[model samples]
Target chain A: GDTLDVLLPLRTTGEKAPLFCVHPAGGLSWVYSGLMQHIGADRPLYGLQARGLADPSATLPSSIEEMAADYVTQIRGVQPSGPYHLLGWSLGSLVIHAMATQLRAEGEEVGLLVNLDQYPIDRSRPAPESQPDQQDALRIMLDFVGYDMDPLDYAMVADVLRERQSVFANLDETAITALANVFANSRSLFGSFAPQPLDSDVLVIVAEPDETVPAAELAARVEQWRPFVTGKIEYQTVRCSHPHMMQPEPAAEIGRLIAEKLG
Target chain B: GDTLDVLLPLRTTGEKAPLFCVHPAGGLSWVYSGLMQHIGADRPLYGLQARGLADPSATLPSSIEEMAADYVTQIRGVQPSGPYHLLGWSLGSLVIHAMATQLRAEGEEVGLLVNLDQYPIDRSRPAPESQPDQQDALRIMLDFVGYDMDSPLDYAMVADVLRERQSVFANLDETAITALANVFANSRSLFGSFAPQPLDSDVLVIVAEPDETVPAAELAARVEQWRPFVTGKIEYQTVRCSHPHMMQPEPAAEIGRLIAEKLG
Candidate 1:
């Protein structure tokens, strides 16, 4: 019925409740590889990657709720039980949060929701609410792939992207093509999402104020979720910024916290 | 001698104060090729291209100030006098504005400063970033030829990709692309720390009406933002194009005519 194969089992050996990690903005679930070490060996970890990235023919869900329903179905296929744990980072948070809300409607038990470092899409925040241009989006993508540039050097990257449109020619086009699909679909899905009151307590792990992501923007997101979340909304902070917070050592700190919370 | 020879004189025959143009992010001063004609034959027009864009061996300036210093020195070498005119487009605005501030500090007189379709860098704002990486790059790139990586890309990787992408844009090789990207990327850092003191020279800000990049503000609102730092005559005119169109044909001629008119 759904693309059940998109669920990449990161650590399936655990007997405990499974934590399904949604893909970040880059749309690669595999980038979460290092995150499992800190999540504990006993906890089952499944990463639900975006579908369209791999299959060129695939189209993304028209709405966030639709994507959530697909994800909910996939998770049900795995455990088919109550208290399913959901987690995500950046754009992934937007997906999983919507999923948790959907699971509530379907009368499923959501044990936890771990949203790592993404602002709530409540639409009320007047500032920092602009959609990025295609060029800006690519520049942000460059940062995720370990490219640390001074904030404005996006032009150089843009030119590179512009001139070398098929530079990934030799490499698997799937990687780039799939990524394009994931990015475009997710952006569309993000716009279509409508936040409802979530039944599960959300654990928000936000990045520290970096040059790119501001502290005020991160802080305001927590407040915006106040009315929408019916359960206890737990907020935590790591010393690192967005994608880096999910990386090894800092992620180790986040992992330690995860063990304490869900252990 | 000051590095005046390096300035790509788009038009050299003019007798008036040469309009020194700052190159935008792409580092190609040739983008200004269309504007030289409208500046009129009597006024010289020089586009100050960034260093190390064409030659892989050259290194770019780390800060906007350092970059401006080089250009200011070059301008001095050529004219050796007061009343120098400066202008820039997009990122080029930052370069020329910086040059203007420095010119004043060094006891020089800047007759005119023209800024086209660029917002002055005001650092009181935080970094606004979003996610869109490899595929995102490809999504837009593919719109033309049909398209996009991970891992920290080496110049070889950048070059190899560029080689395959568009047959090496403007005949740039792997080395040149790498060099260009290096400067382009680093320019972001320069902007972060870059806040400028207002210029004494009258700034002619030519703005795009209903700027596609920023829908909220039209030409006046855009010009209003620069009011704090500009001490001299701040006159502005409107162009019916986005930042990109400001470089193209009809509007480019319109812009060129405006510059020629203001040069008086």
Candidate 2:
């Protein structure tokens, strides 16, 4: 119970099943304040901040497996009603994937598993001869989000990205010495976890404006994993850029979609 | 003409009426080089660097009126056999409007006036309460260009913009004062001259992007001026962005539209 911190909703009616929302990289649970308007007030909403990010006193895990274990321990403490619904965004998607696999293995009921805009894919695969530099990826991402980056920063961001890849590349040492220990650990957790069959209904929300995971690729990956789910597997795409799902109009629509699904 | 030195295209073939390109506030003539491909080679293109920008030796104009007169004299010297076509981007748009008006008044033939994403609207007039600050405007402009000013030398670049504005605001004064000289000058220019006129065989091309100007109110205002010449007017909403039309793929499409509207 010590690991599971109950985040009191901004406004609560205290009757609905508690929603455990996970945080993305360099983000706190409070970042979901933008979604507060759409989420049902009847349900209790819990924002789960990963170990190392918000907790300055907490020692970071060395790998994604360690992070998943830590989250599993936290979920056990919460002891929610039989099947708990879980949602994760970006890096949190990896964490939830690991958590969901662990929970299902332990025979704990999971009502729903929602992964937002991230897939377990090797991002560091050597650039194909046709796709030379990372600019092609960056351009696609920027175009998808309807934003642009300065052409000059291309090389520098690319370099930083390579260092960040250790967390995603299945290289254990990358998680140990990463600039941000939690990020590295989370990447390790997601990268190392094997895909498992889920007993719960699952939903994957792909960001329409997401440049990280191509929309088509995300849809295909979810389809590939569909056979593993006991309940219905649903995939939805939202029209917001990568980052927060709180971009006014897009977020509003996403909220509507989530409500419709939950209802 | 003394003004001929001012209007001389930095690079151009002398055989044709040279394409007269005007630079925005911190810009040089070289900005048009990327645009040259879209413009094609039939007409020689010349870019006019704003005075006191990139050219340390050039003196700043006392007023925008003087700058407009100087542009007129320069264009006349390089006038093509047919009517001369004029194009301006951003601040360059303001310059072209004045120059075109002056040229027409002097009985010179101006074939077309192309305004790229800017209008001669007076900002001093009361605007909606939601008007953005200059810092916000600068941020939007920087984002449009997709360049980050976060590097160590970024402040140096910002200072360059400040220095250029000071040079114009003080009207070539030696004393350096910090404020928005370019914005102020543009505001002054817009307020001074926005008269209704018959373009008379002259074409007007307004090229902009939807997201850049959003509602296209500015482009609409510029288009409204040449109502009588509507047949000769072409409005191009580029899918690219606000800054650096050269970077966008829509330039070729813009070129095609220009030829159809102006040459046809």
Candidate 3:
């Protein structure tokens, strides 16, 4: 069985432009279920689930390059025709950007690249190893919104703060053990590659209350890419938090933005 | 403000005869640093910390009742004291337990109760409305962990793999937010309710791995208190992990076990 899972809406009779939506980590194709109906029923929407997560048996690829190579192979197998539009959410944006770059390099006509809340420029600094002790990390997270809390309460709250600070998953005990080993080996291999430019038209969606990544930083990175691409590059901010795409109002606004941009 | 943060530890040091060690979640404590040298220099040692993690803050309390009333106050404090020893790790295994069951009612003389890990248990849950999207939560954390990889080589190899599991973190974040709110609230309210139990005999030393809970789990539930408290015991373990008390074998087998046998 294949490691990646693809979901599509019910087929309509007439042929329509194909748009592929890739999910972020831990996200399945259904996460974008709201976006499909909102993007208009006319276009064919395809949602791609990352490998390993979709297929429990599949070996996880080590780097973004490997993931991109795997995705490109999958794209070829489907033989998606011209006027292909691709969209990615969060980390999914990185995967699709790499695939779009590969297609454009091969002389394929790519229509649009819709990037939601991510740009190629590296905004984050490397995390300090010894500086922030566990207590400090907890304090920083609590004080992020500027709240002074009791120490006992902070310790308790620290217990449940699941920041994707570690990639290991408890659900698959086998994978968790292997991931520790893999992490030791692949950390350097992936960092060697630099961010590549997107050659196709791009649309960047910024979330309003995005505490994860600052909106100003994302805007600066997108501006840097404006000069390189063939298609018109534009930016818009949806009125919602970082997780707005999963909720109805913000998600509907995002869909409307995409439909208008694509049309 | 004192640089040392001394209240919880001071309150846990006064108990009567045999010392019983109580651990907290993610057991680990610094409260017992010079304890062995002063009180139970020659006595058997009994230590305790939470079962799953080494540090007090690593694991979430199962519930407010378990934390504030049961685990913190009743179970460790008042249950099995009589010229007996008692020590609480992070979250005051000594005082909270005493508050829960009214330690004085038991008529059990608490030789000593040392709280090592933290102050008190918090009781808030994350608000249901503010939950983040599961996928978005995962992505944010994956990006953080991916960026935080120890070595450049580690980052290169695990970037995509880390990104793949972003959803799990997202789910954890929502639950954790609620749990943290409660913990914060509990810590503020449960201050200075009970005086520390005094130890009459030589102090027993309970050590834990830097990564484990200070007062370990076996003692927390009163599963086998007789072995540690019959004649004032201090339990100690040395190792490091999420919950050092329960998980560390070297200290438990070599130090904790030996002390238990001596006390028995």
Instruction: List, residue by residue over A1-263, the lDDT tens digit for candidate 1.
Output: 22224788878898898888887755656556666877778898888877765455565565567777788888898898868888787677888888888877878788878877676542322112222122334544454344554523333443444355443233343344344345544543443345788766888886674546666666676756777788877777777746466555666777778878887
lDDT of 2: 0.50
- Cα-based lDDT at residue A182, candidate 3: 26
What TM-score do all the candidates reach, one by one? 0.51, 0.38, 0.41
Clashes of each: 7, 6, 93
Query: In candidate 3, residue A185 scores what lDDT?
Result: 19
Q: Which predicted model would earn the best TM-score?
A: 1
lDDT by residue (B211-246, candidate 3, tens digit) is 334465743433223233223443433334222232
Best by lDDT: 1
The lDDT values for all models are: 0.63, 0.50, 0.43
Clashing pairs in 1: A53-A178, A141-B133, A152-B188, A153-B185, B14-B42, B142-B147, B198-B229
Q: How would the docking of model 2 be graded?
A: incorrect
In model 2, how large is the Cα lDDT of residue A247? 56
Q: What lDDT score goes with residue A171 in model 3?
A: 26
Q: Write the candidate numbers in order of decreasing TM-score.
A: 1, 3, 2
True contacts kept of 3: 0.00
Instruction: DockQ winner between 1 and 3, please give it.
Output: 1
What is the total number of backbone clashes in candidate 1? 7
Q: Per-residue alpha-carbon lDDT of model 1 for B108-211, expressed as tens digits?
A: 78887888766754343312121112222222222222222112122334334544665624354434534444444444334544567777778888886644
Off by over 4 Å in 1: A1-263, B1-7, B55-63, B121-170, B174-184, B188-192, B210-218
Relative to the true structure, candidate 1 has a C-alpha RMSD (angstroms) of 11.1
- Please, what are the lDDT tens digits per residue for candidate 2 over residues A179-206? 1233323422332234556666778776
